[PDB]
Amino acid sequence: ATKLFPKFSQGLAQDPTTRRIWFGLAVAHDFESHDGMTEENLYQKIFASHFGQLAIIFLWTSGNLFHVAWQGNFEQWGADPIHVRPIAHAIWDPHFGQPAVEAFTRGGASGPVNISTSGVYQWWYTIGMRTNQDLYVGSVFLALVSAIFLFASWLHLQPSFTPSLSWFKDAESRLNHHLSGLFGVSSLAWTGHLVHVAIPESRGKHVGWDNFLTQLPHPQGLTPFWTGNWAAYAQNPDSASHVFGTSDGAGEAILTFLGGFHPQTQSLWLTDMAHHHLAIAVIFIVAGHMYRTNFGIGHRMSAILDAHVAPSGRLGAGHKGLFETVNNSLHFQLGLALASVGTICSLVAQHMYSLPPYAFLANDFTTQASLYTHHQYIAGFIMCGAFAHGAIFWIRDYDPEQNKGNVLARMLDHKEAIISHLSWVSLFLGFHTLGLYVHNDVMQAFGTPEKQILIEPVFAQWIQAAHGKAFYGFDLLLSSSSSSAASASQTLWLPGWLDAINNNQNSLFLTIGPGDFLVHHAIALGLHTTTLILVKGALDARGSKLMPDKKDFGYSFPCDGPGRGGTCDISAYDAFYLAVFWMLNTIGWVTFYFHWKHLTLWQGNVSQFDESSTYLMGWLRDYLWLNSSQLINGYNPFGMNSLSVWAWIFLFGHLVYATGFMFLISWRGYWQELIETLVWAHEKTPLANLVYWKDKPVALSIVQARLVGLTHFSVGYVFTYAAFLIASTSGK
Amino acid sequence: SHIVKIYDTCIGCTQCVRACPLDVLEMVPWNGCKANQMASAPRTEDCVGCKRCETACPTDFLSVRVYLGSESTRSMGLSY
Amino acid sequence: FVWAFSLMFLFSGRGYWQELIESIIWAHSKLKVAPSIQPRALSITQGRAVGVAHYLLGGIATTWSFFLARIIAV
Amino acid sequence: RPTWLPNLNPPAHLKGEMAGDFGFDPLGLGADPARLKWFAEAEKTNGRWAMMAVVGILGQELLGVQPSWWNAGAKDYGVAMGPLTAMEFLIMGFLETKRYQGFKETGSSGLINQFPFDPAGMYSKDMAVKEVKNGRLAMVAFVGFAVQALASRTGPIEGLTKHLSNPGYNITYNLTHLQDVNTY
Amino acid sequence: AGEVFIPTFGFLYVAGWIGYVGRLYLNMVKGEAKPTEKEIIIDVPAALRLTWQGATWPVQVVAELRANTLTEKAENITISPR
Amino acid sequence: GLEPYLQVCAGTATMLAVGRFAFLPLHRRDLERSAATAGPKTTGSTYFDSLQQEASFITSTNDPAGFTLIDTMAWGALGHALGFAFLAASSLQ
Amino acid sequence: GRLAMLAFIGFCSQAAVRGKGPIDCLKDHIADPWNNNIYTSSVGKETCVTVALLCVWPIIIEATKSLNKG
Amino acid sequence: AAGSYPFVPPSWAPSVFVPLTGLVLPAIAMATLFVYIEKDN
Ligand code: CHL
Numbered sequence A: 001a002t003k004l005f006p007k008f009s010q011g012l013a014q015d016p017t018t019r020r021i022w023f024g025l026a027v028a029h030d031f032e033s034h035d036g037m038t039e040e041n042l043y044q045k046i047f048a049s050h051f052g053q054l055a056i057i058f059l060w061t062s063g064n065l066f067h068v069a070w071q072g073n074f075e076q077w078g079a080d081p082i083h084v085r086p087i088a089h090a091i092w093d094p095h096f097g098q099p100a101v102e103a104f105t106r107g108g109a110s111g112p113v114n115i116s117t118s119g120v121y122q123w124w125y126t127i128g129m130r131t132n133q134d135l136y137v138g139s140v141f142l143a144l145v146s147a148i149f150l151f152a153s154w155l156h157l158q159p160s161f162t163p164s165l166s167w168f169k170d171a172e173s174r175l176n177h178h179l180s181g182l183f184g185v186s187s188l189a190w191t192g193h194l195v196h197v198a199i200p201e202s203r204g205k206h207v208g209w210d211n212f213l214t215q216l217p218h219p220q221g222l223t224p225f226w227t228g229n230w231a232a233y234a235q236n237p238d239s240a241s242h243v244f245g246t247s248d249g250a251g252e253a254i255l256t257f258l259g260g261f262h263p264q265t266q267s268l269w270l271t272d273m274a275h276h277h278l279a280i281a282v283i284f285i286v287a288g289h290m291y292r293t294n295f296g297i298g299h300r301m302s303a304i305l306d307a308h309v310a311p312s313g314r315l316g317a318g319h320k321g322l323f324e325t326v327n328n329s330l331h332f333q334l335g336l337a338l339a340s341v342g343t344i345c346s347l348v349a350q351h352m353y354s355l356p357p358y359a360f361l362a363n364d365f366t367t368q369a370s371l372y373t374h375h376q377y378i379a380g381f382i383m384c385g386a387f388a389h390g391a392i393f394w395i396r397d398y399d400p401e402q403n404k405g406n407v408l409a410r411m412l413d414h415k416e417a418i419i420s421h422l423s424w425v426s427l428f429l430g431f432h433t434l435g436l437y438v439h440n441d442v443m444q445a446f447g448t449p450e451k452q453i454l455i456e457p458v459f460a461q462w463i464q465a466a467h468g469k470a471f472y473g474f475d476l477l478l479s480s481s482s483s484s485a486a487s488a489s490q491t492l493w494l495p496g497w498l499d500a501i502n503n504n505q506n507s508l509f510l511t512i513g514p515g516d517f518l519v520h521h522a523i524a525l526g527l528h529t530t531t532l533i534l535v536k537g538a539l540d541a542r543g544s545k546l547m548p549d550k551k552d553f554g555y556s557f558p559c560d561g562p563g564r565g566g567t568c569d570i571s572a573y574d575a576f577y578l579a580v581f582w583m584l585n586t587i588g589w590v591t592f593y594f595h596w597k598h599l600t601l602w603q604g605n606v607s608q609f610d611e612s613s614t615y616l617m618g619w620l621r622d623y624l625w626l627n628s629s630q631l632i633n634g635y636n637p638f639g640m641n642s643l644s645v646w647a648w649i650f651l652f653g654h655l656v657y658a659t660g661f662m663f664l665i666s667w668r669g670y671w672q673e674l675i676e677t678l679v680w681a682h683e684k685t686p687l688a689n690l691v692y693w694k695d696k697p698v699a700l701s702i703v704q705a706r707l708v709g710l711t712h713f714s715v716g717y718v719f720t721y722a723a724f725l726i727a728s729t730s731g732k
Numbered sequence B: 001s002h003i004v005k006i007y008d009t010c011i012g013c014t015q016c017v018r019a020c021p022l023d024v025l026e027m028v029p030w031n032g033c034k035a036n037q038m039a040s041a042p043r044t045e046d047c048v049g050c051k052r053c054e055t056a057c058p059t060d061f062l063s064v065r066v067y068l069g070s071e072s073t074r075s076m077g078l079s080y
Numbered sequence C: 001f002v003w004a005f006s007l008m009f010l011f012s013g014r015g016y017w018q019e020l021i022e023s024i025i026w027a028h029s030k031l032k033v034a035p036s037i038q039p040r041a042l043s044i045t046q047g048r049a050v051g052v053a054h055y056l057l058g059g060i061a062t063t064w065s066f067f068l069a070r071i072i073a074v
Numbered sequence D: 001r002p003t004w005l006p007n008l009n010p011p012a013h014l015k016g017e018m019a020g021d022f023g024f025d026p027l028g029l030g031a032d033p034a035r036l037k038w039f040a041e042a043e044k045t046n047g048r049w050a051m052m053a054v055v056g057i058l059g060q061e062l063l064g065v066q067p068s069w070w071n072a073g074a075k076d077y078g079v080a081m082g083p084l085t086a087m088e089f090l091i092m093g094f095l096e097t098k099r100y101q102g103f104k105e106t107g108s109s110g111l112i113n114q115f116p117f118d119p120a121g122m123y124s125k126d127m128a129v130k131e132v133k134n135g136r137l138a139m140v141a142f143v144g145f146a147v148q149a150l151a152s153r154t155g156p157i158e159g160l161t162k163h164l165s166n167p168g169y170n171i172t173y174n175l176t177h178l179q180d181v182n183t184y
Numbered sequence E: 001a002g003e004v005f006i007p008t009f010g011f012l013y014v015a016g017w018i019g020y021v022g023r024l025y026l027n028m029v030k031g032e033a034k035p036t037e038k039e040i041i042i043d044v045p046a047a048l049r050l051t052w053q054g055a056t057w058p059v060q061v062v063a064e065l066r067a068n069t070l071t072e073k074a075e076n077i078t079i080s081p082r
Numbered sequence F: 001g002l003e004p005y006l007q008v009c010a011g012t013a014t015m016l017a018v019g020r021f022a023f024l025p026l027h028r029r030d031l032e033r034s035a036a037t038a039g040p041k042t043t044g045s046t047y048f049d050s051l052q053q054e055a056s057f058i059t060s061t062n063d064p065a066g067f068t069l070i071d072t073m074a075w076g077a078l079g080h081a082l083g084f085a086f087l088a089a090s091s092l093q
Numbered sequence G: 001g002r003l004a005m006l007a008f009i010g011f012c013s014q015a016a017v018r019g020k021g022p023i024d025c026l027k028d029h030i031a032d033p034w035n036n037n038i039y040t041s042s043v044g045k046e047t048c049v050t051v052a053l054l055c056v057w058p059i060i061i062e063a064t065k066s067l068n069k070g
Numbered sequence H: 001a002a003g004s005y006p007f008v009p010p011s012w013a014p015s016v017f018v019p020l021t022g023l024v025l026p027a028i029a030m031a032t033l034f035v036y037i038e039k040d041n
């Protein structure tokens, strides 16, 4: 009879098959579809759900601090961060054999433990933490914060504390508060930590909760700030002879603009990081005082959007009629948020390898590699969600009559132009980028390396020379001291930026060769193609010659039948499903280029990359095959070492990846009929016929199997690489 | 159960009816076509969502539309 | 390459390619270079055949190169 | 009716009925009545605790208790802080649960069981306007007593008996001459 | 200049030559009886009379831009429902 | 003299004066068209969302030309960031 | 049915736990109560935390009908 | 309840938490959910 599992979906609740259990977990956080859903209730539910996610994040962080403190080597690693290996947690495996118990005792422990690649150690050291107590206190604090958010999820869901839809649609104020309070007052507050705790701790001086109200951050005090002589805070910077966590070479500056990196830590200076947060905090607070609130002075967002219509009428009604579109659509906003967060997630990876922001971060190669790959992959999934929710906006929440002539409606007008032009660029990048790899491979095979085509990335080399790179010899801007920009900065960060950029032992603007030219264009191909797939699905989300009523069929529908030749994978969910593969392929190439460019940098054999990368055969034998030699030997017929888990995961990843294929290659039908035979056998089998199924066994849904196979496929690509990226970098 | 709807763009060809595998469609009399017939969907409780009728609709786009929705033993065609 | 290329027909669907072709045809019809014969995406059964064909061709070719170069060299 | 802002427009929710209503709600935090009702008991009780506290910080110092009011907490009192604070939780916990219970019922204050706590009466409009206004002055004072301890490290009375002595020694001297008070 | 630069135009000239000759043939078979049966069984004679016509393709292509005949009117190209 | 007072005072004064007689009318005109015409009225009604609803103390200034407290704290705020950007710039840079 | 069998609950040491015997702990407390209490014992820190938490549970439960289940 | 931090877990905590979380705890969750999932309406 009817079940209760799918409370939100009565159809699933009445479903006699097992699909009700599977879909009940999927259609669970799609409230917009829940039976009896009001816009205000939807916002209130989402608002509370946000608190829940914030409780998990803080609880997750507290756990890391707790395990690092209870089962870690922080104090030992802090004493010698270039020899001690940060310990993440202990391995209590009731299955471990004695050799496993021995081999996994590393980083200075009395039992099997796991070295950490998250880089929390380097970060917590740089910010002021020095003992295990600092970690315990922080974990308790964050745990309390998690408890508070959890109560708030309850409080904001109980009548009288449930915000009205109007409050949820109060944009002008929300943006003002978030920009000034959430972004600004949280950056100045951070400068307050740095100036008061981090900088003193780096100069060897405990300024904790016991003596912070009595310890002057600057010798002069707030006097220079009040007198306006702000410069006093930028005098006596820490000398190059300074040692992090020691008064050796320690200076007195609190806010400066030295640039480059501390000599010993090889990471951005703290003072330069203090002044950064102070400067950005000021901008955020002032920017917060822009939109109108309940006082008067201010800007109404609607007016700005409507007042921006090109007089030539090239953009039609311009942004007029767009404020309601964004304010009344929670998919449009989510798409913009995912796009913004995704892009910034990549900036963190591209700016944290070049400029290590934490002490002794560069030294830890395995951490650096596993942190770049983490963010670059997370960023890619976020970007797929951006376009995904954008397509949902086109169908679930787009009013074609209100948006009439607006920049958003004149996009579908030239939808073919946008889609077709993205096709030409993808083909051009594909036909050529690959052709100049096969051409080089042929020359390598025929022993004619000189004949291989090696185009020079001159355009990038000039942007490098502009920043001050001299190797190329172009004498442009910063490269030329007699310049205006070079002379202007000569008294600020310039003296340092050059010293650091013109040092080949780090990753600030690394020398690029013709090998980088090909891979960079290959990355572009992935960016354009993945984009084309998502863009095509978004534009054709509610329209198409094959399926002109796609909006009536919703977002996630298997197909429109075998009619009109084939409607297989015609839903805008299947532009996402397919784009995911290209996203993984694109990120795969970028995280493989990072790893090789850097493994060759760290091993000292830069010529290895500068030559093998030119042809694809080098990428496989010199990179994947050569580095995999150790990982695969984690456990052999002669014994096992500490890399056994990674070898096991490496194979485990392949298994999950291959399993994903069956759900994608095979389709619903052979399995369904097979399940029918299984149902017959059980009903006929004696002693087993007694036990029976409450839900009728049915094969996975057409769309369901698409996501199940894709999850297996993705999980594999992640575990298989995470294993390589960590066991090949650590093994050396 | 799947939702089957017959739009005014029907020519009363009866092809969709002679195509339904579970007797879900029938031909009722109408006046907007020269064949004085318009397919109706009396028993959409037996619709499996095969969409065979659509593959048999000759009118521009589709006069008959099957919107796959809730799934039951009949809708899933389960003999279990 | 051939083995991997086969996973675009074994994991995808005509629906996506048919519409994609529609946009390409538009570009062709704008410059008045549209082909007289209507370009249509591969049938559901055809895509299944193309993928399996390339999938088998690629894998067997990989082993053929592996085995032959291994055993001829050693 | 008196207004904090000259020529003010008392918000709709702020009616003359309430104790020291001077129409002060730049943000209208108590626009909702239930919240405003609680806020008013939470205004009175924050003030009750601040009046008591300010009296201590002055009194303790005037008699001459040894540690400065701020350092008073760190002392060799004859009791381990652990059990001490543990009892603090038990006594105040009850003393507070009883109060909340009564406030949940009689929308006034009180002690334990004697709500409309008066043992003298004196619950007139005048005395309750005095309470809200003496409380507000005390709440502002305690925030002073705290920042004059940070920037100048001088007890309340000692601070008055240094600005009266030298008409300078002001916020324009303390903040600038912090180096002397604090340590590097 | 001999590397990439000069080679660039060389490909562009032949590329446009191939494309222009193709469109010349397509637009000739359009109209002619059954245009679909002259794409499978190519008319090698007329296909051989149009190959050299693409030698001066740049001159002819521009003359078509400056005459509005290279492209089609936007109200004569079928578009997918928005 | 040339102490912080000279820089801070001048900045505050100039901005307030320029915003009390020069841009004040433009400021008012821009506020109107923006909030009344293209932008409509917010806080329709219902809920304790009166927080988003305009206050009143701001709309209570005898000052001619209606220089509200928010305007004084607006132009003055702009002025206190010029006094401290001019002094600070001379400090180093 | 709640009973004063709590003495025999922490019967590890009867009234006290992992601290001397039974009626001896009473005599000890009378002597020096502040320095002879569970809070001033190995389990003192946890006991103080739990005692404090318990003295808030009432208010937490007795809030705006702050209760739930599903 | 020793040294400095008075909440440092005992050495036997792993020999209890790991077994409970992964064998006992999951069984309760799976069984409890199983009943709810199959709960009739
Ligand atoms: C009931 C027992 C009790 C005991 C044993 C103490 C003991 C202490 N108090 Mg405390 N307090 C107590 C209750 C309370 N105090 C305060 C409010 C204050 C203030 C305003 C100050 C102290 C301070 C201090 C410490 C002075 C030494 C020092 O530099 O700080 C070492 C000790 C600490 C830092 C502990 C204080 C932690 C934190 C600031 C608490 C913040 C919330 C509340 C103020 C109260 C928290 C709960 C109470 C029970 C501690 C000291 C050890 C002084 C201090 O320096 O503390 C900042 C001080 O200025 N107390 C409240 C108000 C709710 C209490 C309520 O029960």
Ligand code: CLA
Pocket: A046, A047, A050, A051, A054, A167, A168, A170, A171, A173, A174, A177, A178, A180, A181, A182, A183, A186
């Ligand atoms: C000063 C006032 C203020 C402040 C501080 C906030 C703050 C917040 N609001 Mg909010 N809001 C306000 C006023 C305010 N609001 C008003 C007046 C309204 C009425 C319109 C709303 C309505 C509102 C709604 C409807 C929602 C929020 C939400 C949120 C939260 C966003 C989630 C998050 O984690 O962001 C955090 C982001 C930052 C702290 C800064 C971003 C910096 C980027 C992302 C990265 C920086 C990393 C840095 C460079 C390096 C880090 C290194 C290391 C630390 C890891 C956030 C904590 C959401 C929520 O509830 O979530 C729970 C939400 O649903 N607000």
Ligand code: CLA
Pocket: A423, A426, A427, A428, A429, A430, A431, A434, A525, A529, A532, A533, A578, A579, A581, A582, C001, C004, C005, C006, C007, C008, C009, C011, C012, C016, C020
């Ligand atoms: C190794 C596997 C593989 C390869 C090589 C490709 C390659 C490509 N995919 Mg793809 N894809 C794959 C797997 C793969 N995919 C998988 C597993 C999925 C998930 C199902 C997808 C899903 C997907 C989608 C959704 C899309 C693509 C698209 C594309 C094209 C992007 C445009 C381009 O770069 O043009 C460059 C052209 C080439 C690189 C071809 C090289 C030239 C040929 C090989 C030479 C000519 C033939 C030669 C002379 C001899 C061979 C034939 C002879 C025997 C007769 C591209 C050719 C996009 C697209 O279709 O473009 C519009 C797109 O929409 N893919």
Ligand code: CLA
Pocket: A420, A421, A423, A424, A427, C024, C025, C027, C028, C031, C033, E018, E019, E020, E021, E022, E023, E025, E042, E047
């Ligand atoms: C007259 C033949 C002809 C012409 C003029 C064009 C022209 C064009 N094509 Mg196209 N194409 C053709 C044939 C042709 N194509 C054929 C036969 C196919 C099937 C393989 C395709 C498949 C194709 C795709 C998938 C795409 C284009 C695209 C494009 C545009 C991008 C420009 C470009 O780089 O070319 C691109 C050309 C190709 C990628 C492959 C065609 C190359 C062949 C070898 C040229 C045709 C020669 C022809 C047989 C000669 C006939 C002579 C006659 C006497 C028999 C462009 C206007 C892109 C686009 O739409 O831009 C928005 C794009 O996405 N074409």
Ligand SMILES: CC1=C(/C=C/C(C)=C\C=C\C(C)=C/C=C/C=C(C)\C=C\C=C(C)\C=C\C2=C(C)C[C@@H](O)CC2(C)C)C(C)(C)CCC1
Pocket: C031, E004, E005, E008, E015, E016, E017, E018, E019, E020, E023, E057, E061, E070
């Ligand atoms: C100098 C040069 C290069 C410089 C490139 C730079 C800076 C900008 C390039 C812009 C480019 C390459 C193209 C812009 C094209 C835009 C439009 C609207 C042109 C479309 C062309 C059309 C429609 C013609 C199609 C043709 C017709 C109609 C008939 C036949 O001609 C065939 C065909 C299909 C070509 C670099 C990359 C350095 C490299 C070195 C050569």
Ligand SMILES: CC1=C(/C=C/C(C)=C/C=C/C(C)=C/C=C/C=C(C)/C=C/C=C(C)/C=C/C2=C(C)CCCC2(C)C)C(C)(C)CCC1
Pocket: A282, F012, F016, F072, F073, F074, F075, F076, F077, F078, F080, F081, F084
């Ligand atoms: C009554 C009247 C008048 C007038 C007077 C006056 C005197 C006015 C002014 C007023 C004012 C006086 C205004 C101002 C305002 C301002 C504000 C309210 C703010 C300030 C500050 C700031 C804005 C700052 C900020 C910051 C910081 C905090 C730190 C560093 C950085 C910065 C600087 C950025 C006259 C006589 C003509 C006549 C008639 C009557």
Ligand SMILES: CC1=C(/C=C/C(C)=C\C=C\C(C)=C\C=C\C=C(C)\C=C\C=C(C)/C=C/C2=C(C)CCCC2(C)C)C(C)(C)CCC1
Pocket: A061, A065, A124, A137, A138, A139, A141, A142, A213, D150
């Ligand atoms: C724990 C931990 C963490 C987290 C963090 C977060 C997320 C948050 C926090 C937060 C916090 C923990 C903060 C602090 C605070 C404090 C304060 C804030 C105090 C101050 C004091 C004073 C005395 C001052 C005052 C004032 C102001 C405020 C304004 C102006 C004026 C004045 C200066 C007077 C991490 C993960 C990183 C790691 C490690 C651990």
Ligand SMILES: CC1=C(C/C=C(\C)CCC[C@H](C)CCC[C@H](C)CCCC(C)C)C(=O)c2ccccc2C1=O
Pocket: C008, C009, C010, C012, C013, C014, C015, C017, C018, C040, C041, C042, C043, C044, C047, C048
């Ligand atoms: C890529 C792909 C396509 C597109 C495949 C196409 C368009 C086949 C490509 C064949 C050629 C490239 C097109 C034209 C063929 C001509 C005979 C070539 C003449 C060109 C001259 C150079 C001779 C599908 O149609 C499809 C359908 C169902 C499931 C998956 C897929 C799928 O993955």
Ligand code: SF4
Pocket: A558, A559, A560, A561, A562, A563, A566, A567, A568, A569, A667, A702, C044
């Ligand atoms: S094969 Fe499957 S996905 Fe394709 S049309 Fe048929 S039912 Fe739909």
Ligand code: SF4
Pocket: B002, B004, B019, B020, B021, B022, B023, B024, B025, B046, B047, B048, B049, B050, B051, B052, B053, B054, B066
């Ligand atoms: S989907 Fe199949 S069973 Fe249902 S009406 Fe159409 S033809 Fe009949």
Ligand code: SF4
Pocket: B006, B009, B010, B011, B012, B013, B014, B015, B016, B017, B038, B039, B053, B056, B057, B058, B059, B063, B064
């Ligand atoms: S196939 Fe279409 S036109 Fe023919 S009877 Fe059915 S609905 Fe009418």
Ligand SMILES: [Ca+2]
Pocket: A128, A129, A130, A131, A134, A201, A206, A207, A208
């Ligand atoms: Ca410290």
